[PDB]
Amino acid sequence: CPEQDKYRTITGMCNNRRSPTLGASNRAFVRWLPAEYEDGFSLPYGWTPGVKRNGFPVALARAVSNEIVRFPTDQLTPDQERSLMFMQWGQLLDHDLDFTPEPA
Amino acid sequence: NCETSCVQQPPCFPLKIPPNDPRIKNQADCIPFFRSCPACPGSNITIRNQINALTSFVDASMVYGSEEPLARNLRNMSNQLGLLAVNQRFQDNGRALLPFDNLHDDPCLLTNRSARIPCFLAGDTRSSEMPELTSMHTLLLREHNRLATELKSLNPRWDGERLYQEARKIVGAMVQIITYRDYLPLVLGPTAMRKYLPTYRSYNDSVDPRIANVFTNAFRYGHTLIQPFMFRLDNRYQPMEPNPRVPLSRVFFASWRVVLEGGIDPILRGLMATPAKLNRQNQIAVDEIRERLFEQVMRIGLDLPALNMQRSRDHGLPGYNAWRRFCGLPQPETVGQLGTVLRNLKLARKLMEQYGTPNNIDIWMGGVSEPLKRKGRVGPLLACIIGTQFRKLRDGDRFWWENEGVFSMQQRQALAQISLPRIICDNTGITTVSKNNIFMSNSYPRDFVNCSTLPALNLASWRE
Numbered sequence: 284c285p286e287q288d289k290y291r292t293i294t295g296m297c298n299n300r301r302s303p304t305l306g307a308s309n310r311a312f313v314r315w316l317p318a319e320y321e322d323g324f325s326l327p328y329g330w331t332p333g334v335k336r337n338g339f340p341v342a343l344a345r346a347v348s349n350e351i352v353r354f355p356t357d358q359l360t361p362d363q364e365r366s367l368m369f370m371q372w373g374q375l376l377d378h379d380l381d382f383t384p385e386p387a
Numbered sequence: 388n389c390e391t392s393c394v395q396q397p398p399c400f401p402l403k404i405p406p407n408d409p410r411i412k413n414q415a416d417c418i419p420f421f422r423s424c425p426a427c428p429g430s431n432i433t434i435r436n437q438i439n440a441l442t443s444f445v446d447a448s449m450v451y452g453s454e455e456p457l458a459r460n461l462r463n464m465s466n467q468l469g470l471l472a473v474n475q476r477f478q479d480n481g482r483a484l485l486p487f488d489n490l491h492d493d494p495c496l497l498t499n500r501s502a503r504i505p506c507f508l509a510g511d512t513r514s515s516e517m518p519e520l521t522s523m524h525t526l527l528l529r530e531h532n533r534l535a536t537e538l539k540s541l542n543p544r545w546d547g548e549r550l551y552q553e554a555r556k557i558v559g560a561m562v563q564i565i566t567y568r569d570y571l572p573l574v575l576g577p578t579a580m581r582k583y584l585p586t587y588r589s590y591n592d593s594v595d596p597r598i599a600n601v602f603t604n605a606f607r608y609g610h611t612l613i614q615p616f617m618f619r620l621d622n623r624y625q626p627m628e629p630n631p632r633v634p635l636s637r638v639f640f641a642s643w644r645v646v647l648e649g650g651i652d653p654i655l656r657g658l659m660a661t662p663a664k665l666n667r668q669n670q671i672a673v674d675e676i677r678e679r680l681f682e683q684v685m686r687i688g689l690d691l692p693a694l695n696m697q698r699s700r701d702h703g704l705p706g707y708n709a710w711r712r713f714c715g716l717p718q719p720e721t722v723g724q725l726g727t728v729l730r731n732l733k734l735a736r737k738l739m740e741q742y743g744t745p746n747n748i749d750i751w752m753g754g755v756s757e758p759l760k761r762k763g764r765v766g767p768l769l770a771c772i773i774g775t776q777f778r779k780l781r782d783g784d785r786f787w788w789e790n791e792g793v794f795s796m797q798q799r800q801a802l803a804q805i806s807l808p809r810i811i812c813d814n815t816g817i818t819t820v821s822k823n824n825i826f827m828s829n830s831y832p833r834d835f836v837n838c839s840t841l842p843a844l845n846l847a848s849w850r851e
């Protein structure tokens with residue numbers, strides 16, 4: 284890293300002088316807790332038929348959505364104390380912080 | 388190809404369909420899903436981790452880009468004004484639009500076959516996902532260029548590089564100010580705000596500023612705020628005919644709407660004058676994202692809440708109780724204990740029927756289920772995950788706007804006067820905007836004021 288600077292780099296490299304890739308783009312996320320995979324290192328829970336998670340069947344994400352998330356749109360409650368701009372800033376802000384790439 | 392097949396082979400992890408599904412009658416069908424790219428592909432040593440393609444810093448990288456080639460291509464190199472490149476085919480009532488991108492498989496081109504309007508090119512690849520998002524991206528493109536113009540008038544000797552860097556620095560500080568002064572207290576509520584985000588002291592080079600894997604899923608709490616329509620309003624803040632409430636399933640990647648249906652002014656007014664959807668324990672997320680996500684550009688509508696849960700499993704994220712323990716919050720074990728945590732025994736019963744144990748509840752599901760903090764829009768667990776992350780992004784940023792040496796005292800004093808309604812006033816044909824706080828204000832004319840009552844950013848202290 285250059286001993287002195289005035290602006291941020293585009294990648295985020297050299298913001299932390301001691302460990303200069305921290306917060307830099309195209310780097311692995313930090314783990315606040317160790318990962319929990321079906322095989323311990325790579326396969327996700329729900330991958331292998333019959334393999335339970337911590338003594339119980341893995342709930343289909345779609346079944347959790349249907350049973351818990353699904354609601355009649357006619358019942359929607361507008362937020363009296365928040366504008367739709369509050370939702371929009373959240374997505375734009377998320378898009379300054381993280382993008383998890385996938386193969387096209 | 389994960390979009391066209393239901394085969395569970397690398398790199399696919401399709402969402403299986405339950406029996407008696409209210410939409411997908413064939414259990415042989417699935418919801419498309421591509422596993423996130425691993426940091427170390429094919430490894431027999433590593434515990435699979437995912438990559439963040441962006442700078443974790445609140446540095447407005449969604450405007451400027453997170454990679455040098457893209458950052459160069461987003462700039463206007465045809466002069467020395469230090470401007471970002473603008474659309475060369477269209478303008479919004481004489482005002483700048485984002486340039487178009489050149490995508491191999493352009494989804495925007497599919498939203499309206501006849502309009503032939505491609506996706507926009509910005510610092511982040513998702514700028515076109517919803518026109519409301521495109522509008523915020525367009526607003527900031529214009530703000531940079533407006534700052535660069537005013538900086539050139541103040542410092543005529545400054546070259547293109549210097550003007551671009553100084554305008555970029557101001558834009559980043561405006562994104563940091565709106566986020567921490569206006570946005571984050573209304574997310575967390577005053578109690579969690581005081582606990583996780585105490586008064587900034589100074590830069591600490593031992594604070595890890597990386598995005599935690601859990602945060603990519605926890606921060607999706609915002610999907611509970613999504614209204615099922617895009618709302619467009621005219622200069623009287625009245626429904627802009629003939630399409631005032633366009634269903635969200637008809638706006639995804641619909642960049643043709645910004646270009647051919649009135650630009651970003653009706654969209655910004657709709658965002659300011661329409662309430663957010665309120666998250667309630669029996670009103671979590673709308674079918675516009677639950678049944679019809681990307682309906683016009685996929686073989687079937689996707690389910691965003693279900694994608695969130697599948698994503699947390701893809702990423703090997705621990706369950707609800709492990710995150711409760713991490714945050715020093717009690718771990719319910721029984722349906723009665725969960726009933727107390729949620730202050731909702733009916734929901735605790737449904738969660739228990741689905742998961743069998745509270746240990747297995749997916750972080751997004753558990754997180755959005757919790758009652759909301761007072762004057763906040765998240766429960767204790769999401770407030771702990773969100774607050775912790777934003778404290779690290781602030782305390783671990785060497786270029787934080789309040790860090791000594793970043794700005795002068797006179798510049799910091801000038802920056803403390805900025806606001807999102809003022810940026811809207813300076814870069815659009817909108818002359819009436821929301822009163823501060825913009826994230827709270829939502830009723831026209833009651834929470835509205837004319838632009839003439841708001842002071843502009845004073846650039847006097849940027850004179851060299």
Ligand SMILES: *[C@@H]1O[C@H](CO[C@@H]2O[C@@H](C)[C@@H](O)[C@@H](O)[C@@H]2O)[C@@H](O[C@@H]2O[C@H](CO)[C@@H](O[C@@H]3O[C@H](CO)[C@@H](O)[C@H](O[C@H]4O[C@H](CO)[C@@H](O)[C@H](O)[C@@H]4O)[C@@H]3O)[C@H](O)[C@H]2NC(C)=O)[C@H](O)[C@H]1NC(C)=O
Pocket residue numbers: 591592593594595778779782
């Ligand atoms: C600069 O920032 C680092 C990191 O800050 C950490 O993250 C932030 C986002 C925020 O959450 C901070 O509050 C958090 O600390 C600071 O360095 C950390 O400092 C603490 C306290 O010194 C360390 O915790 C210690 O960990 C030891 C593990 O070996 C443990 O032995 C210590 O506990 C024992 O001792 C104490 C005191 O006798 C006692 O109270 C305990 O009960 C126990 O016996 C202690 O928990 C962190 O590990 C440090 N983290 C890093 C990365 O180095 C730093 O202090 C801060 N500096 C300034 C000036 O603000």
Ligand code: HEM
Pocket residue numbers: 370371372373374377381382383384516517602603604606607608609610612613691694695698
């Ligand atoms: C119009 C609003 C929004 C969408 C449309 C939308 C869509 C998505 C999709 C499809 C994903 C990826 C799904 C998957 O895992 O396969 C996604 C991810 C993330 N969002 Fe979404 N989102 C909309 C709006 C918001 C709001 C308001 C949010 C927060 C306040 C929000 C957050 C996120 C985050 C953090 C992610 C993960 C991003 C990553 O890749 O690292 N979204 N959203």
Ligand SMILES: N[C@H](c1ccccc1)c1ccccc1Cn1c(=S)[nH]c(=O)c2[nH]ccc21
Pocket residue numbers: 382383384385494512513516640681684685
């Ligand atoms: N593959 C997505 C697509 C969507 C419609 C048609 C064809 C293809 C896609 C394309 C371009 C940018 C992003 C995405 C996905 N995406 C979106 S929309 N939002 C996130 O936050 C996100 N994170 C990781 C991924 C992703």
Ligand SMILES: *[C@@H]1O[C@H](CO)[C@@H](O)[C@H](O)[C@H]1NC(C)=O
Pocket residue numbers: 463465466470471472473474475
């Ligand atoms: C660059 O700036 C000039 C002057 O404002 C403008 O006319 C031109 O269209 C811009 N070029 C691009 C590619 O945006």
Ligand SMILES: *[C@@H]1O[C@H](CO)[C@@H](O)[C@H](O)[C@H]1NC(C)=O
Pocket residue numbers: 499501502643647
């Ligand atoms: C597609 O775009 C054209 C403008 O090019 C517009 O007239 C038409 O109504 C759009 N189609 C739909 C279904 O809205």
Ligand SMILES: [Ca+2]
Pocket residue numbers: 379380441442443444445446447448449
């Ligand atoms: Ca960033």
Ligand SMILES: [Cl-]
Pocket residue numbers: 313314315316599600601602
């Ligand atoms: Cl994590």
Ligand SMILES: [Cl-]
Pocket residue numbers: 473474475476485486487
């Ligand atoms: Cl263009």
Ligand SMILES: [Cl-]
Pocket residue numbers: 513516
């Ligand atoms: Cl998106």
Ligand SMILES: [Cl-]
Pocket residue numbers: 621622623816817818819
């Ligand atoms: Cl107006």
